[PDB]
Write a protein that binds this ligand. Structure first.
Ligand SMILES: CNc1cc(Nc2cc(C3CC3)[nH]n2)nc(Nc2ccc(CC#N)cc2)n1
Length: 289
Protein backbone atom coordinates (compact mmCIF):
# COMPACT_ATOMS: atom_id res chain seq x y z
CA UNK A 1 0.00 0.00 0.00
CA UNK A 2 2.41 2.66 1.33
CA UNK A 3 5.05 0.82 -0.78
CA UNK A 4 2.75 1.31 -3.81
CA UNK A 5 1.32 4.78 -3.03
CA UNK A 6 4.58 6.56 -1.92
CA UNK A 7 8.25 6.68 -2.96
CA UNK A 8 10.82 6.96 -0.18
CA UNK A 9 13.96 9.10 -0.46
CA UNK A 10 16.57 10.30 2.11
CA UNK A 11 16.49 10.26 5.92
CA UNK A 12 15.35 13.66 7.33
CA UNK A 13 16.35 15.69 10.49
CA UNK A 14 12.80 5.62 14.17
CA UNK A 15 14.14 6.56 10.71
CA UNK A 16 12.36 9.57 9.19
CA UNK A 17 12.50 9.61 5.43
CA UNK A 18 11.32 12.23 2.94
CA UNK A 19 8.77 10.64 0.61
CA UNK A 20 6.52 11.64 -2.32
CA UNK A 21 2.86 10.59 -2.68
CA UNK A 22 2.81 9.28 -6.24
CA UNK A 23 -0.78 10.04 -7.24
CA UNK A 24 -0.63 13.71 -6.10
CA UNK A 25 3.12 14.47 -6.42
CA UNK A 26 3.34 16.17 -3.00
CA UNK A 27 6.19 15.65 -0.48
CA UNK A 28 5.91 14.21 3.03
CA UNK A 29 7.94 13.11 5.98
CA UNK A 30 7.43 9.43 6.98
CA UNK A 31 8.43 8.12 10.45
CA UNK A 32 9.19 4.45 9.88
CA UNK A 33 8.66 2.24 12.92
CA UNK A 34 9.84 -1.35 12.91
CA UNK A 35 7.12 -3.29 14.80
CA UNK A 36 8.26 -6.94 14.40
CA UNK A 37 9.74 -7.44 17.92
CA UNK A 38 7.78 -4.74 19.78
CA UNK A 39 6.86 -5.43 23.44
CA UNK A 40 3.23 -4.82 24.50
CA UNK A 41 4.26 -1.70 26.29
CA UNK A 42 5.80 -0.27 23.08
CA UNK A 43 2.81 -1.10 20.88
CA UNK A 44 0.72 1.05 23.34
CA UNK A 45 3.33 3.84 23.06
CA UNK A 46 3.08 3.83 19.28
CA UNK A 47 -0.72 3.64 19.21
CA UNK A 48 -0.54 6.58 21.62
CA UNK A 49 1.80 8.67 19.49
CA UNK A 50 -0.43 8.09 16.45
CA UNK A 51 -3.46 9.05 18.48
CA UNK A 52 -1.71 12.16 19.84
CA UNK A 53 -0.52 13.22 16.37
CA UNK A 54 -4.12 12.85 14.94
CA UNK A 55 -5.63 14.91 17.82
CA UNK A 56 -3.26 17.88 17.48
CA UNK A 57 -4.19 20.20 14.55
CA UNK A 58 -2.52 23.63 14.97
CA UNK A 59 -0.71 26.31 12.94
CA UNK A 60 2.50 25.66 14.85
CA UNK A 61 2.57 21.86 15.11
CA UNK A 62 3.67 19.60 12.21
CA UNK A 63 0.50 17.92 10.88
CA UNK A 64 -0.06 14.18 10.47
CA UNK A 65 -1.19 13.30 7.00
CA UNK A 66 -1.79 9.56 7.51
CA UNK A 67 -1.01 6.60 9.74
CA UNK A 68 -0.32 3.37 7.85
CA UNK A 69 0.11 -0.05 9.48
CA UNK A 70 1.82 -2.81 7.40
CA UNK A 71 3.55 -6.18 8.13
CA UNK A 72 6.63 -5.39 10.21
CA UNK A 73 6.35 -1.58 9.88
CA UNK A 74 4.14 1.32 10.86
CA UNK A 75 4.32 4.64 9.05
CA UNK A 76 3.33 7.97 10.49
CA UNK A 77 3.19 10.26 7.42
CA UNK A 78 3.54 14.00 8.22
CA UNK A 79 3.47 17.13 6.13
CA UNK A 80 6.97 18.14 4.96
CA UNK A 81 8.15 21.47 6.35
CA UNK A 82 11.17 22.68 4.49
CA UNK A 83 12.66 25.66 6.35
CA UNK A 84 14.94 23.57 8.60
CA UNK A 85 15.76 24.04 12.28
CA UNK A 86 14.98 27.46 13.81
CA UNK A 87 18.45 27.85 15.35
CA UNK A 88 20.19 27.23 11.99
CA UNK A 89 18.02 29.95 10.36
CA UNK A 90 18.71 32.51 13.12
CA UNK A 91 22.48 32.32 12.56
CA UNK A 92 21.87 33.11 8.84
CA UNK A 93 19.92 36.42 9.47
CA UNK A 94 21.15 40.01 9.08
CA UNK A 95 18.93 41.29 11.93
CA UNK A 96 18.24 39.45 15.20
CA UNK A 97 16.64 41.11 18.24
CA UNK A 98 14.62 40.22 21.38
CA UNK A 99 11.55 41.13 19.28
CA UNK A 100 12.50 38.23 16.97
CA UNK A 101 13.13 35.84 19.90
CA UNK A 102 9.78 36.96 21.42
CA UNK A 103 8.05 36.07 18.17
CA UNK A 104 9.56 32.59 18.14
CA UNK A 105 8.71 31.84 21.78
CA UNK A 106 5.21 33.14 21.20
CA UNK A 107 4.67 30.56 18.46
CA UNK A 108 6.26 27.81 20.58
CA UNK A 109 4.10 28.75 23.57
CA UNK A 110 0.98 28.56 21.33
CA UNK A 111 1.96 25.07 20.24
CA UNK A 112 2.57 24.07 23.89
CA UNK A 113 -0.71 25.59 25.07
CA UNK A 114 -2.60 23.62 22.46
CA UNK A 115 -0.88 20.32 23.40
CA UNK A 116 -1.68 21.04 27.04
CA UNK A 117 -5.36 21.84 26.33
CA UNK A 118 -5.60 18.48 24.47
CA UNK A 119 -4.05 16.65 27.46
CA UNK A 120 -0.63 16.11 25.85
CA UNK A 121 2.77 16.76 27.42
CA UNK A 122 5.56 16.73 24.79
CA UNK A 123 8.47 16.09 27.24
CA UNK A 124 11.23 16.69 24.71
CA UNK A 125 11.11 20.35 23.69
CA UNK A 126 14.58 21.05 22.37
CA UNK A 127 15.97 23.02 19.34
CA UNK A 128 16.02 20.05 16.89
CA UNK A 129 12.21 19.82 17.25
CA UNK A 130 11.64 23.48 16.38
CA UNK A 131 11.34 23.65 12.59
CA UNK A 132 10.52 26.44 10.15
CA UNK A 133 7.59 25.88 7.75
CA UNK A 134 9.57 27.09 4.72
CA UNK A 135 12.66 29.08 3.63
CA UNK A 136 10.40 32.16 3.14
CA UNK A 137 10.90 35.11 5.52
CA UNK A 138 8.37 35.06 8.40
CA UNK A 139 7.72 31.29 8.00
CA UNK A 140 5.96 29.81 11.07
CA UNK A 141 7.86 27.90 13.75
CA UNK A 142 6.48 24.33 13.95
CA UNK A 143 6.81 21.83 16.76
CA UNK A 144 7.88 18.31 15.72
CA UNK A 145 8.45 14.83 17.20
CA UNK A 146 5.83 13.56 19.64
CA UNK A 147 7.76 10.35 20.05
CA UNK A 148 8.18 10.91 23.82
CA UNK A 149 4.79 12.66 24.28
CA UNK A 150 2.35 11.41 26.92
CA UNK A 151 -1.37 11.80 27.62
CA UNK A 152 -2.34 13.26 30.95
CA UNK A 153 -5.80 13.53 32.56
CA UNK A 154 -6.42 17.26 33.18
CA UNK A 155 -3.74 18.55 35.58
CA UNK A 156 -3.10 15.03 37.02
CA UNK A 157 0.65 14.72 37.60
CA UNK A 158 2.51 11.43 38.07
CA UNK A 159 5.94 9.87 37.71
CA UNK A 160 5.90 8.96 34.03
CA UNK A 161 9.62 8.20 33.81
CA UNK A 162 12.84 9.75 32.58
CA UNK A 163 12.55 11.13 29.09
CA UNK A 164 14.10 14.08 27.34
CA UNK A 165 17.43 15.70 26.58
CA UNK A 166 19.71 16.47 29.55
CA UNK A 167 20.15 20.26 29.23
CA UNK A 168 16.34 20.68 28.98
CA UNK A 169 15.28 18.38 31.84
CA UNK A 170 13.26 19.87 34.71
CA UNK A 171 14.12 19.63 38.38
CA UNK A 172 11.04 17.51 39.22
CA UNK A 173 11.94 14.93 36.62
CA UNK A 174 15.55 14.82 37.95
CA UNK A 175 14.27 14.39 41.55
CA UNK A 176 12.12 11.48 40.27
CA UNK A 177 8.96 13.31 41.43
CA UNK A 178 5.45 13.45 40.04
CA UNK A 179 5.33 15.79 37.01
CA UNK A 180 3.26 16.89 34.06
CA UNK A 181 2.60 19.98 31.92
CA UNK A 182 5.04 22.31 33.69
CA UNK A 183 8.04 20.29 32.37
CA UNK A 184 7.30 21.73 28.93
CA UNK A 185 7.42 25.31 30.22
CA UNK A 186 10.76 24.61 31.95
CA UNK A 187 12.15 23.46 28.54
CA UNK A 188 10.63 26.59 26.99
CA UNK A 189 12.55 28.69 29.55
CA UNK A 190 15.82 27.02 28.58
CA UNK A 191 15.11 27.59 24.88
CA UNK A 192 14.19 31.25 25.57
CA UNK A 193 17.51 31.84 27.42
CA UNK A 194 19.45 30.40 24.45
CA UNK A 195 17.31 32.44 22.10
CA UNK A 196 18.47 35.62 23.90
CA UNK A 197 22.21 34.99 24.39
CA UNK A 198 23.07 31.89 22.27
CA UNK A 199 24.33 29.66 25.08
CA UNK A 200 22.51 27.43 27.65
CA UNK A 201 21.60 28.37 31.25
CA UNK A 202 22.90 24.95 32.43
CA UNK A 203 26.10 23.34 31.14
CA UNK A 204 28.73 20.96 32.49
CA UNK A 205 30.89 18.37 30.62
CA UNK A 206 29.97 16.07 33.55
CA UNK A 207 26.28 15.53 33.55
CA UNK A 208 25.84 14.60 37.17
CA UNK A 209 27.16 18.12 37.83
CA UNK A 210 24.73 19.52 35.21
CA UNK A 211 21.78 17.78 36.89
CA UNK A 212 22.78 19.28 40.24
CA UNK A 213 22.70 22.79 38.70
CA UNK A 214 19.24 22.13 37.25
CA UNK A 215 17.90 20.74 40.56
CA UNK A 216 19.30 23.86 42.21
CA UNK A 217 17.98 26.09 39.37
CA UNK A 218 21.35 27.78 39.36
CA UNK A 219 21.50 30.01 36.32
CA UNK A 220 22.36 33.67 36.12
CA UNK A 221 22.40 36.59 33.70
CA UNK A 222 26.10 37.41 33.37
CA UNK A 223 27.42 40.79 32.24
CA UNK A 224 28.17 42.13 29.63
CA UNK A 225 25.70 40.34 27.34
CA UNK A 226 22.68 40.33 29.71
CA UNK A 227 23.17 44.01 30.57
CA UNK A 228 21.36 45.03 27.35
CA UNK A 229 18.59 42.40 27.70
CA UNK A 230 15.32 43.98 28.90
CA UNK A 231 14.19 43.27 32.49
CA UNK A 232 10.82 42.00 31.12
CA UNK A 233 12.59 39.20 29.16
CA UNK A 234 14.65 38.29 32.28
CA UNK A 235 11.37 38.38 34.28
CA UNK A 236 9.77 35.82 31.91
CA UNK A 237 12.81 33.44 32.01
CA UNK A 238 12.60 33.63 35.79
CA UNK A 239 8.92 32.63 35.80
CA UNK A 240 9.49 29.65 33.49
CA UNK A 241 12.77 28.53 35.22
CA UNK A 242 11.15 28.41 38.65
CA UNK A 243 12.02 25.19 40.48
CA UNK A 244 8.62 24.71 42.17
CA UNK A 245 6.34 23.52 39.27
CA UNK A 246 3.18 24.65 41.06
CA UNK A 247 4.54 28.18 41.09
CA UNK A 248 5.87 27.98 37.48
CA UNK A 249 4.12 30.05 34.81
CA UNK A 250 1.70 28.25 32.49
CA UNK A 251 1.61 28.56 28.69
CA UNK A 252 -1.65 30.53 29.01
CA UNK A 253 -0.17 33.09 31.47
CA UNK A 254 3.18 33.27 29.56
CA UNK A 255 1.28 34.32 26.42
CA UNK A 256 -0.27 37.18 28.44
CA UNK A 257 3.21 38.37 29.48
CA UNK A 258 3.97 41.83 27.99
CA UNK A 259 7.29 40.82 26.47
CA UNK A 260 5.34 38.23 24.42
CA UNK A 261 2.01 39.95 23.78
CA UNK A 262 3.18 43.60 23.72
CA UNK A 263 6.44 42.85 21.91
CA UNK A 264 6.39 45.95 19.64
CA UNK A 265 6.62 48.27 22.70
CA UNK A 266 8.29 46.00 25.36
CA UNK A 267 10.89 43.89 23.54
CA UNK A 268 14.12 45.46 22.33
CA UNK A 269 14.43 45.99 18.54
CA UNK A 270 18.21 46.04 18.89
CA UNK A 271 20.38 43.71 16.88
CA UNK A 272 22.27 41.16 19.01
CA UNK A 273 25.30 40.14 16.94
CA UNK A 274 26.93 38.36 19.92
CA UNK A 275 23.93 36.01 20.24
CA UNK A 276 24.15 35.07 16.54
CA UNK A 277 27.88 34.25 17.02
CA UNK A 278 27.23 32.14 20.14
CA UNK A 279 24.40 30.32 18.42
CA UNK A 280 26.86 29.49 15.62
CA UNK A 281 29.14 27.88 18.22
CA UNK A 282 26.15 26.25 19.96
CA UNK A 283 24.88 24.75 16.71
CA UNK A 284 28.42 23.51 15.93
CA UNK A 285 28.79 21.94 19.41
CA UNK A 286 25.40 20.07 19.15
CA UNK A 287 26.00 18.73 15.55
CA UNK A 288 29.11 17.14 17.06
CA UNK A 289 27.06 14.63 19.19
C1 LIG B 1 15.06 20.60 6.46
N1 LIG B 1 15.19 20.20 7.89
C2 LIG B 1 14.32 19.37 8.49
C3 LIG B 1 13.11 19.09 7.89
C4 LIG B 1 12.21 18.25 8.50
N2 LIG B 1 11.00 18.00 7.88
C5 LIG B 1 9.87 17.57 8.50
C6 LIG B 1 9.80 16.68 9.52
C7 LIG B 1 8.49 16.52 9.71
C8 LIG B 1 7.87 15.66 10.80
C9 LIG B 1 8.80 15.40 11.97
C10 LIG B 1 8.44 14.26 11.01
N3 LIG B 1 7.78 17.24 8.84
N4 LIG B 1 8.61 17.83 8.12
N5 LIG B 1 12.58 17.73 9.68
C11 LIG B 1 13.74 18.01 10.28
N6 LIG B 1 14.03 17.49 11.50
C12 LIG B 1 13.42 16.42 12.09
C13 LIG B 1 13.00 16.53 13.42
C14 LIG B 1 12.40 15.43 14.05
C15 LIG B 1 12.25 14.21 13.38
C16 LIG B 1 11.61 13.03 14.08
C17 LIG B 1 10.17 13.25 14.28
N7 LIG B 1 9.05 13.37 14.45
C18 LIG B 1 12.66 14.08 12.06
C19 LIG B 1 13.24 15.19 11.43
N8 LIG B 1 14.60 18.83 9.69
Amino acid sequence: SMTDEYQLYEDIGSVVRRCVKLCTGHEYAAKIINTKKLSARDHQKLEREARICRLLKHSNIVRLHDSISEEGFHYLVFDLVTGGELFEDIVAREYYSEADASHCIQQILEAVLHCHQMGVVHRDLKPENLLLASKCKGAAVKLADFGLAIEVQGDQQAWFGFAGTPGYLSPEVLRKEAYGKPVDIWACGVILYILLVGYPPFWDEDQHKLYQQIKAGAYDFPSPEWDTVTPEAKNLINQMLTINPAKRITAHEALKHPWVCQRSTVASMMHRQETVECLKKFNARRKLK
